[PDB]
């Protein structure tokens, strides 16, 4: 049955925009094979049939033939259940700590970007060093079911990393613009894991311009005064 995801706009009203839920489904469709479209909103002026699909504005949303599935969790959930072998290849992971390994990054990313304040930026940029090395170690360490290998779960892509590494991106992408920070080069792991998942047309192809990522967080990322 035909497959159309909603995903945001960006800056220009069309291109695609940041959101590291739309990337995430993106991820996912493109892993499981299937034959899909994908249209963007501009949130600012939506079209008719777009205001009628979707009268709440959530977004991203999919269409799966005729029906509309909202929330990122849920739709993934339906996808891996529905787009299931031998057609198509089950995208979860073995190790269940693979579905939270370093999905802590993102929010403490998030309230140091949002902070001015020196004297609070010196404690949030150290919880956020540590919630990346505490991934490192994730990545770094064997793991129980299936270290070397490429990503979060094993050498393939799995949904945890269809989860995680947009939000990696942006996190990487924000702070070294606004913050000239970079993460640390000590963390062996998690470089590899980012440029393993670099060298992936996945993640690759479906990242947001870095302008435009940049753009999205204008009204969100302060300067340290």
């Known amino acids: 049955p035909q497959v ?12 695609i925009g940041n959101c590291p839920f739309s990337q995430r489904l993106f ?9 899909f479209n994908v249209t963007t909103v501009d949130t600012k002026r939506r079209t008719e049939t777009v205001q009628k699909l979707c009268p709440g504005g959530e977004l991203p949303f999919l269409l799966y033939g005729t029906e509309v599935h909202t929330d990122t969790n849920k739709i993934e959930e339906f996808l891996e259940a529905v787009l299931c072998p031998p057609r198509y290849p089950k995208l979860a992971a073995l190790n269940p700590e693979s579905n939270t390994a370093g999905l802590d990054i993102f929010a403490k990313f998030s309230a140091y970007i949002k902070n001015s304040n020196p004297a609070l930026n010196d404690n949030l940029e150290k919880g956020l060093l540590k919630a990346l090395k505490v991934l490192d170690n994730y990545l770094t360490s064997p793991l129980p079911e299936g270290s070397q290998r490429k990503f ?20 990487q992408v924000v702070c070294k613009k606004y913050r000239g920070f970079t993460i640390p080069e000590a963390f062996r792991g998690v470089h590899r894991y980012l440029s393993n998942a670099y060298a992936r047309e996945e993640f690759a192809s479906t990242c947001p311009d870095d302008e435009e990522i940049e753009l999205a967080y204008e009204q969100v990322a302060k300067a340290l005064k």
């Open 4 to 15: 159309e995801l909603f995903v945001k706009a960006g800056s220009d009203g069309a291109k």
């Open 27 to 35: 991820m996912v469709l493109w892993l499981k094979g299937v034959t």
């Open 152 to 171: 979060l779960d094993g050498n393939e892509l799995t949904l945890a990393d269809c989860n995680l590494l947009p939000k990696l991106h942006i996190v």
